[PDB]
Amino acid sequence: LIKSLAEKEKQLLERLEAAKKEAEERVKRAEAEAKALLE
């Protein structure tokens, strides 16, 4: 109830980091489609 809870909350925050990276991935594919359609 100290070390496991600290590491679990850390792992929850890491999953939130993965969600922010996949939102950045969606920004990336929006950029890719914008440049490809303009070309």
Partner: protein, 50 residues
């Protein structure tokens, strides 16, 4: 005199809850100020935890 009275009051208030705050912080060292869980600590009575 003001500094001495304030320091004596501060030393008394620190000594009134010195070891128990340390023990509660050592117990609650994983969620101290995490934004999902408030930890109500209570310096409560003897072994009637049920």
């Amino acid at each position: 005199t003001r500094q001495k009275q304030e320091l004596e009051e501060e030393l008394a208030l620190a000594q009134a809850y010195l070891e128990p705050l340390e023990r509660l912080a050592a117990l609650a060292h994983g969620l101290d100020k995490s934004p999902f869980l408030r930890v109500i600590p209570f310096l409560l009575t003897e072994k009637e935890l049920p």
